Structure formats: structure tokens, C-alpha cells
Design a protein around this nucleic acid. Sequence first.
RNA 1: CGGGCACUCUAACGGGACUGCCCGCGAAAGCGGGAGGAAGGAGGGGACGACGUCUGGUCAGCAUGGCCCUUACGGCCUGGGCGACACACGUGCUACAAUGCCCACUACAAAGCGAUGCCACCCGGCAACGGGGAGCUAAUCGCAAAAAGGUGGGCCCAGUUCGGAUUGGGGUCUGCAACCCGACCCCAUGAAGCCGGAAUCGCUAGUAAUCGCGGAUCAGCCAUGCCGCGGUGAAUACGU
Lengths: 23, 116, 127, 97, 155, 83, 206, 60, 97
Amino acid sequence: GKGDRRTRRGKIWRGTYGKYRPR
Amino acid sequence: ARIAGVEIPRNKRVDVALTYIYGIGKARAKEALEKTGINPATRVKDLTEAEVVRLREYVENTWKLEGELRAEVAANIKRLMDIGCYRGLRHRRGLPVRGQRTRTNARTRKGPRKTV
Amino acid sequence: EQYYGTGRRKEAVARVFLRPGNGKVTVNGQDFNEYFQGLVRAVAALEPLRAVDALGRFDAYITVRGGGKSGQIDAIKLGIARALVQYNPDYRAKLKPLGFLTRDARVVERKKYGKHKARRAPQYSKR
Amino acid sequence: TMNITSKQMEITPAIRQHVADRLAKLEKWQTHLINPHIILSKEPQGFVADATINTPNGVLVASGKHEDMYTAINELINKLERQLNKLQHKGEARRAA
Amino acid sequence: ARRRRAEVRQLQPDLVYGDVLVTAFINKIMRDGKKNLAARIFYDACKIIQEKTGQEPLKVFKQAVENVKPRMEVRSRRVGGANYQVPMEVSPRRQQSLALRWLVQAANQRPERRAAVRIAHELMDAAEGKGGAVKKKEDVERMAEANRAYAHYRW
Amino acid sequence: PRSLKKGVFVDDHLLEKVLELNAKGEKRLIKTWSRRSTIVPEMVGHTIAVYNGKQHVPVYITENMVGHKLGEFAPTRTYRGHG
Amino acid sequence: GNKIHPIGFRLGITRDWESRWYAGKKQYRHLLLEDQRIRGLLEKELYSAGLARVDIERAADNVAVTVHVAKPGVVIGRGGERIRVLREELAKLTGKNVALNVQEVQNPNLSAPLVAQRVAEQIERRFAVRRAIKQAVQRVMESGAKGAKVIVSGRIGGAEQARTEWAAQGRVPLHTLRANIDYGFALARTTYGVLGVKAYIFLGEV
Amino acid sequence: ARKALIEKAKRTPKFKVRAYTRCVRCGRARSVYRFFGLCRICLRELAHKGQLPGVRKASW
Amino acid sequence: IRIKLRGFDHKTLDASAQKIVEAARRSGAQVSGPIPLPTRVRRFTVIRGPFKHKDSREHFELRTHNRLVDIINPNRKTIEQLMTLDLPTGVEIEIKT
RNA sequence: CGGGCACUCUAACGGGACUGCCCGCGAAAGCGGGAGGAAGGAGGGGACGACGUCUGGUCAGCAUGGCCCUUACGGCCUGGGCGACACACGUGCUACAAUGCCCACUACAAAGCGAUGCCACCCGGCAACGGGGAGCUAAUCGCAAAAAGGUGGGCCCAGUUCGGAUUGGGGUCUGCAACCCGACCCCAUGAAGCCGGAAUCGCUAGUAAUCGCGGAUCAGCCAUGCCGCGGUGAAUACGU
Ligand SMILES: [Mg+2]
Ligand SMILES: [Mg+2]
Ligand SMILES: [Mg+2]
Ligand SMILES: [Mg+2]
Ligand SMILES: [Mg+2]
Ligand SMILES: [Mg+2]
Ligand SMILES: [Mg+2]
Ligand SMILES: [Mg+2]
Ligand SMILES: [Mg+2]
Ligand SMILES: [Mg+2]
Ligand SMILES: [Mg+2]
Ligand SMILES: [Mg+2]
Ligand SMILES: [Mg+2]
Ligand SMILES: [Mg+2]
Ligand SMILES: [Mg+2]
Ligand SMILES: [Mg+2]
Ligand SMILES: [Mg+2]
Ligand SMILES: [Mg+2]
Ligand SMILES: [Mg+2]
Ligand SMILES: [Mg+2]
Ligand SMILES: [Mg+2]
Ligand SMILES: [Mg+2]
Ligand SMILES: [Mg+2]
Ligand SMILES: [Mg+2]
Ligand SMILES: [Mg+2]
Ligand SMILES: [Mg+2]
Ligand SMILES: [Mg+2]
Ligand SMILES: [Mg+2]
Ligand SMILES: [Mg+2]
Ligand SMILES: [Mg+2]
Ligand SMILES: [Mg+2]
Ligand SMILES: [Mg+2]
Ligand SMILES: [Mg+2]
Ligand SMILES: [Mg+2]
Ligand SMILES: [Mg+2]
Ligand SMILES: [Mg+2]
Ligand SMILES: [Mg+2]
Ligand SMILES: [Mg+2]
Ligand SMILES: [Mg+2]
Ligand SMILES: [Mg+2]
Ligand SMILES: [Mg+2]
Ligand SMILES: [Zn+2]
């Protein structure tokens, strides 16, 4: 999951924000 | 092959079975179910034929799907390989295109390993 | 009228205030069950008073900062045991036997150079 | 498979095959040779050939030095054979009592 | 160890039944240090064995442990040339360890989909002498019986 | 890719030789060290020699190769395969 | 090689810094670069006088230098002829109030950076190293030190095969922190190579 | 290629990207800390002497 | 009447935090005791060797200790003596209001 | 906010643990056990690395003997390469799923960093981001959300709502400039992979396992690395 860019867990691993992980 | 040229899995939720259409992910799934006001949790085996033709007409008239999508992606690679750009060369020989390492790994583009 | 104790666990530090009452407990502006909901480790903080039958005799205004939820629970356990020893000096027996009056120095060990973690070594290939 | 490394030298695929053919001598024992790595180099004295092989009964480490390059390869094979011949027979020594 | 006999850790009793045997069973269920999740799976299984069987969960859990505890085990010792299977009695420390470990291992190998069901059902059959956890004991106990001839080689 | 807020990048000194050839009449062969420059519609029809670290590869610009860069058509690696 | 530096291992325990001042994040590297330019011009000039330690103090747009030397006359001069000649070229580079002082070395043979430089000079003059080293430890011990050790590595005497020759006497506990150990290094340049001289003087624990 | 590079890095470049940190003491182009302007080797050499104000060995 | 004191050596910093608290306390009047602010450590990790040998480091640090004293009751008698004080070298003072 | 330094804390200086006391074995040294105590027999971790070995590594960080180059084996610049790919090896990241995946809501850290720097808050946008704009030479203000976890809802054993590779199209930012060769966002594509042969690595308590955060270098970043920080928190040691 941590590698999936289109998920919450995946953007926590990367350290970025988006539609699936807003701030 | 009800929609949209393929048969969507019944007994599954409509927002899920719609992804089984070449050209529709989770994004375009939640899109076509609000534009038609159809409950995404309802199962395909429980759909109203009225709700079918509405979801059919909207989906088939908004995004390119199935064979028409495969033609442009092939044609977009076709022109890339015809003009002679660096990305076209990577498609002609079959090597990775997006600046990836080729000394190791790169096995999806090359396929299983060939002993020597 | 009021009794106080101090407890620490790793980085968690708790200030507990024992007051006579029916048994209500407050943690950082909310009740015990509201701050430790669904945590099995919760019921062990109210154990020092269970060893001296002070279950529903006191109320608890308790704050806590630092560490995680479980470290805060153990910090409460040491704190309310201190406030019971000062509530009754004879409470050292039936509290020190159960180890409630001591504070474990088991803290996170330093991550060291050359290792992946505190002691996890990098995998090597001899030959 | 088998890997060869030429440190601060330049060898041909012909010379690389000769090292592969000399390592066939260890196949005599009918035991698994796990990634035999070979290292060649050039001292002031003569060539040096290293080898670090793993077998299911231990590892093999040896070194050969001689003025002739292929001769040092031979010495390395002689010393590898001896270590291999011991790792496959040392257990058979203490069968009694 | 080489120097002294390694001391046995004393587990703090659980917060529901106050049993050190329950705490040990939790840890073997525990993965990645997630004790809260492992605490649920056991206590929820205590509810599951309560529904399908109207008796005390504490009895079904302890009885199942007695029915997996191996009395004799085999431990290899190469004498001369061949590797013999030497029959040895099992110490009470190791008995709990092997009983709890096979219990969870036999549980996870069950078909049902929720871990609480697997943990509950294995304790249902192990309390009654069934399941892969009890078979592992009978199999270990049959292997030590067949090698009773080599009993004199014990250390 | 480059930002839409910023402009379509051409090395200026290269675009100069382009417009000078569009007035008097195309075309004459242009040698350049501008792999970074983007092909522009005013370049369609000419023949530009793009330097690849060694050679100046002649590249004819067409209608379908406008959105790309010059360095995509003068590759930099001689590779015929293995074996 | 496996030994730690005896001075860096005792900073803030037995020995104090040679540059003692505070600076902000935006000015540390600038004041440090000038601090080495001062010791660059001083270690070259004040070599012939017997330089041992260069202290540097700073406050704000001003800097005070303290030079400990065995022969203060070679640094000061005839009534101050060189001392003023130093402050002139000092502020020419410092661009600020460069106040220069002189400090007396009580015992030169008890200073490690001086013992090393004498041994480095001797072996530069075609002297017997095994014989000069024993004299070096003999002079330091006669001067009341409670332990000494000299180490010279390299082509000693001109031999092709290198060699690390050394001599020691007394007590040199390099593992004790509460022991005072003065340490200095000198570089002896020869027609055949470079020798590394190390000096250890154990003045006595605290 | 050495002194011509410690001299190329000192002058002001044509573009502000081409600026890179070098060692002011020895000229090393890698492992140069901004705070001191020194490399990792010189950071350890001057620290062992005491010529880095307030810098000392760490241990915890 | 805020006086902030920063320095690298806490032994010399506390000596300055003592003399300024003592100075304003004598010549009138109220002084808020020297409070120690949390330090700011600037740690450095570096390979011991000048070549390879990655798993060998030495840790250096730069401790920037902080103090703060407050003269509650001013009186210009203190504002003159503090302009003439022997503060050590490795300590920076900041005075604000 | 008044007010207070009690408490937590922050950071300097001390006290404290020394087999000191008791039982027993002891020739002594010491060993087993108990009490007291926050801590007991080096209290846990770090720093510290003996004479020497590997003619070990480092002339490419530096210095240095020498030998060689001298309209060039010096120096400047542009472009390319260090990013190649029939293959082979080592170290890792992410996975093969229900003790799990996804969505919504809600709690609990420590250590650091921050003046063409960190960005509160508002607004445009699905978003990356952009345009406004307060604070903070920073125990003041900011990075900042800690994540696992907790609550609720969905998925129902499928190459799937596992996995997120590869590829098509559309944007953002840095930068003189992202073709070779940057990161990120969004739509679409949705692979191998069903727990791994011979063989082999790590770890004895806050350790392994698992979860997140910060920093150096740094315009940006190929960092899944390195160095630090805490959250949850085991199993096992008969024996040589
Ligand atoms: Mg996970
Ligand atoms: Mg997915
Ligand atoms: Mg689809
Ligand atoms: Mg940890
Ligand atoms: Mg090879
Ligand atoms: Mg070769
Ligand atoms: Mg080569
Ligand atoms: Mg060797
Ligand atoms: Mg032979
Ligand atoms: Mg297990
Ligand atoms: Mg089993
Ligand atoms: Mg049966
Ligand atoms: Mg050149
Ligand atoms: Mg040089
Ligand atoms: Mg740069
Ligand atoms: Mg740099
Ligand atoms: Mg490493
Ligand atoms: Mg007080
Ligand atoms: Mg003892
Ligand atoms: Mg020691
Ligand atoms: Mg050598
Ligand atoms: Mg040389
Ligand atoms: Mg050199
Ligand atoms: Mg260039
Ligand atoms: Mg260039
Ligand atoms: Mg390049
Ligand atoms: Mg590439
Ligand atoms: Mg091969
Ligand atoms: Mg392989
Ligand atoms: Mg990696
Ligand atoms: Mg499956
Ligand atoms: Mg598929
Ligand atoms: Mg398959
Ligand atoms: Mg999927
Ligand atoms: Mg797994
Ligand atoms: Mg095996
Ligand atoms: Mg150990
Ligand atoms: Mg990180
Ligand atoms: Mg940073
Ligand atoms: Mg960066
Ligand atoms: Mg890449
Ligand atoms: Zn340097």
C-alpha cells in the first residue's frame, strides 16, 4: 500500500499531499 | 456485453464493476454514479434497466472506451515510432521509456530473463 | 484535602491529584473511559488503589504529557501509588511487594552508527 | 552463475573462459559450487588470483601467486581442490567409536 | 547461554482474568507488537466459545493447553555416524511454550476468515482432543515412543 | 515538463537564425548545440543539424514533431545490441 | 591506525579551546576562516621563535591574539620593533582591532609542540633518530615531566623500507581523562621524504 | 584539475545554479558543511585540535 | 529590562549570569533570577577515515547554551555600572525592553 | 487575564550504590540469598580501541620523495557521458493479503530545523501548486499532520476494493535550461508476484518485529540511502 500513489498510506510514505491526502 | 461493450461483474457493487471497463478507474466510477444519481453500493444484479440505459448513455458518450481507447494509444505510439524521437526508439526495441535504470531490473519491458 | 503523586514512563509524565469522592477519574479534561477508549492496557493504571481497597474512595484529576497512550497509563500507575503512600505511610506494605512504588528505567536505546537500529546489524555477505 | 573480476587489468573473453575451464576441476566432487567469484590482479612480483566459493558444507578461500598468470590460476585451483577435498571428507574421519 | 542458566521472565497477569498463562497466549497471537489487536482476538474468541458452548472460557482455554502439552519429545544427537532420534522428557517451561505455539499455528491454518473464529474454534477442538494442534502432540509423542530403544543415549 | 506560466523555451540565438531564413527564403543547413530548444511551428520545413556530443545529425522538421525538443531526434548512444 | 587524538579527547575536561568566542550562524565560518589566516601567518613567521599555542579571543569587531613562545624576544624585537611590525600587517588582513600579546613559556622542554619541533629539526639535519629520540625523552623527563613518549614514522635515516621507531619513559596513560597530556606534531621534510614526529608529555593528573 | 577548480568555484559564475560549495581550507568539493565552510575531514581535523569554537565530541 | 545571554561554554555563561544578577541586585533593586533556556545542539557526524570505511563515524556537537535575566526595578544607578563589566570572551549579551 | 513557582518542565551544581548491612560457604579474593532502596552486585546505553598483524586502505581530501607531461598529460568553453543493457552478484524498498485493504471522524511523542528562511490564516484549483498576507533574529512564531492506534462504515477469499510496475494524455515547481536525465500532482492503463531451490543474515529487554518524525548534503532531486528521535512492544536460552 505504501507504494500506491493513489492512496492515503502511499502519500504518507512519499511525504506529499494531494486529493487523496489533503491538508 | 451490456456496458460499454464488455460485461460488468454482477453481484458486485456498481462503482467496482464499472472499473472492469478499459478506461474507467475509481475516479470515473464515482463520476458516472453522481451524474445519474445511482447508489454506488447497489449491486449490478439489482440495477433497474432504466438506471442501466441512463448509465450506459452517459458513460458511452463522455469518455473513449475499449477498442477506441486502444487505437489512439497505439496510434500515439505509432507516431512516436514514426517521427523517430527518443521515446519512439524505446518502443521500437522495447526498452523502458521514462528514464529508468536498464543495467539491472527493467524486467517488465524486457520480459523474463534470457540466459546466455 | 488533596493528595498528589508523580509518575513517569519513557517520555510520558503524569500529575495525579487524589481527592475523596465516589470514584470518578478525569484525564486531560475528559473522563477516563473517554481518553482510554478501546485500550485494553487502561484498567491496569487503577491497580495500586485496588491493592489497598481504595477503588471508589477517591476521585482523580490527572494530567499527562509525553510518550504514547500506554506509557501514560503506566505513568498514572506510579503517580497514584505515590499519592497513596503520602495518603498513608503504612501503605508501603502491600504496594512495594507488588512493585507499584518503583519506576522502570526501560527507555528507548540509542540508535548507533553502523547499525540499522539500536542493535539490528546490516545484513552482510561473507562469500 | 560464475563471476570473474579483473582488478586493474584487462583480460579477454578467451582468458575468462580458461578460468571457467580450470574451475571445472572442482566439479569433480559432485557438489554445489555457489557463485564462485574469481579475482585477478598484478603485483610487482607476479599475478595474484583470489577465489571465494561457497559449498553446502562450508566456504573455500585461497590465493595463488606466480610470475605466469595461468600458473597462478593453477596454484589457486590446487589450493581450492585441497580445501574442497577436506570439507567433503572431514566428517567421515570420526565414525568410530 | 555459556555462563549461567537463563532466567525465566515473569509475565504480568492479564487485566480480564488475571492469569499469566493468558498473557503468554496473547503474545504468540501478537504480531508486530500490536498487543491491543491481539488482545481483542483472544477476548473476542472468548465471546465466540461462549456463544457456541455455554461454559466458562477460562476452562476451555486451560483444558486445551493440557491436551496439547507434550510429555515426551525427540531431540537429535548424531552418535558415531548416523543421526539418532533421542527421546527426552519435556520440562514444564517448554511444555507451555510448545502448547501455546502449536495452538496458534494450528489456528491460523484453519479455513474460517476472521482470526477470532480461528482462535476460538481451535480451542473448541483442542479442549476436546481434536484439531491440528493435538495431532502435533500425538505425532511428537508417537515419534518418541518408537525411539524408546535409544533412551539410554539421553544426556 | 516546463511551466505554462513561463514561455516556450528557445535559445534565442537559435530562433534568430530561424526567422532570418523565413524572410529571405528557406532554407540553409543550420548547425546548432541547442538540444534544449523546443521545436516551433516556424521551424517546420527546415533542416537543422543537432549536435549529439560528436556528430551534427541532420533532422528535417515536420508537422507532427512540433511539441518536442531537438535532442530527441539526434540520439546520443550508439547501441546495436549484444551478441 | 586506531588511536584517538589526545587533545580532542580532552576538550572541556583537561584542555581548553584555542579559539574561544561565540558567533552566530551567519558569522561562524567567516570568523573561523580569519582565525586560520591568523595562525597561518603566525605559524610561518613565529616558527623561528618557538611557537607553541595560538589563542584567539573575539568580542565584536575586535580580536586579541595570545602567542605562547619559548623565546619572546624574537617575537617582540628591539623595544617593540617587530611587535609593532606584526600588529601592522595583522590588522592589514584582519581589517579590525587586532591586539597582539606575547606569553612566556615557563618550560620549553615541557611543551609537546616544542619537543616535536626540536626532534623534527634534528632529524632534518641528518641526525641519528634512534639516538635523538632517547635524548628528547631524556630532556623532558629531566625537566620534571611524569611521563614521555616520542614517535617518528617514515624513512628513518633514509631506508627504503619504512619503519616506526619510538621511545617512552615514565607514565603515559592515554585512556585516563583526568590526566593532563600535552600533545604536539611536527613535520620533518627531508630530501627523501616526510617523517611524522609525535610528542606526548604527561605533566600530571588533576 | 585542482587549483584551476578551487579558483573556478571562487569567482562568480554565469548562472546562480553553477554555484557549489567547496572546502575553504583544502578545496574538497564533497561533504562540505555550510556552517563551517569546511569538508568532513577538515571538520574533524580542526576539531581534534580545538580550533573550532564551542565544538566538542558528542556522547550520549 | 531584558538581558539575554548566549554562549558556547556554560561554565563561562553561568559566571556572567551570576555577575549581572549580582550587579543589578545591589544597586537597586528587584532581579528576576537567571533562568536557563533550552540549549540548541548542532550535531555533526563524519566518517573517521578519509576513504571508504562507511561504518565508522565520530560525533561532534556545538552546544549553544542560553540564559535570561530580568531586572524588575530599574533605576539608572544600574544602567551605568553594567556598561563597565568584565564579561568573559565566549559570551554574547543582548539587552532589549 | 489577575495572580502564583507549588507541580510538570527547562539547565547548571550536588546527593545517591560502595557487596555498605544481614544469613551461609570461604584461607583470602570472591560466590549463592535476603533486607533496605528509584536503582544491587559493571544500574542500562555511549565515549574510550594495548604491543602489533594483514608489504590492509587511502598519491583522488591534504601533505610529500621521485619519475614523467610543458602551444599540453596545463587552462577555458559548449554538448555528450558518469543514467548504456543479451547477462551475472551484493545491499535495500514495496508486496504477495482478512492479526488485511479502503473511506470518514478522533486521540498520544521526542529530537531537530527556520531572515532572497520557516510559513500561520484567507482565496483560486480535484490536486500538485499559485495569488494574497500576519508572526517568528525564534521554550514566544512556524515546519506540524505525528503514524501505528481508537470509533464507525464498506470490501467477503477472488491475481480481488491485494500489489502499484510499466505505458498513453494533461498540469505544477525548481532552474539560464528537465531531450538524453529531476521531483510532484491528476485522468487512464493495472504487470510480475499465491510466501520463494541450493544456500544464507539479524537479534538475549524496551532488544527483535512493526509505526511514524527530523537533520546533514541540498536551486531542485532520482533518499527505498545515511545519521539521529520517539510510539507500540514480544519469543526463547535445556546445554557447549
Ligand atoms: Mg504495513
Ligand atoms: Mg490499490
Ligand atoms: Mg477499467
Ligand atoms: Mg525504537
Ligand atoms: Mg566474470
Ligand atoms: Mg578485463
Ligand atoms: Mg576493468
Ligand atoms: Mg586476499
Ligand atoms: Mg591437482
Ligand atoms: Mg508465533
Ligand atoms: Mg503444528
Ligand atoms: Mg485425534
Ligand atoms: Mg583535461
Ligand atoms: Mg592539489
Ligand atoms: Mg549546486
Ligand atoms: Mg558541495
Ligand atoms: Mg551501511
Ligand atoms: Mg523551586
Ligand atoms: Mg555476586
Ligand atoms: Mg576504560
Ligand atoms: Mg598493498
Ligand atoms: Mg605523487
Ligand atoms: Mg597528493
Ligand atoms: Mg564543462
Ligand atoms: Mg561541459
Ligand atoms: Mg552530463
Ligand atoms: Mg537511464
Ligand atoms: Mg555471466
Ligand atoms: Mg538471481
Ligand atoms: Mg534501497
Ligand atoms: Mg488468497
Ligand atoms: Mg489482472
Ligand atoms: Mg500468476
Ligand atoms: Mg487492484
Ligand atoms: Mg509477512
Ligand atoms: Mg537450506
Ligand atoms: Mg549480547
Ligand atoms: Mg526521512
Ligand atoms: Mg532541511
Ligand atoms: Mg532538498
Ligand atoms: Mg528515476
Ligand atoms: Zn577540507
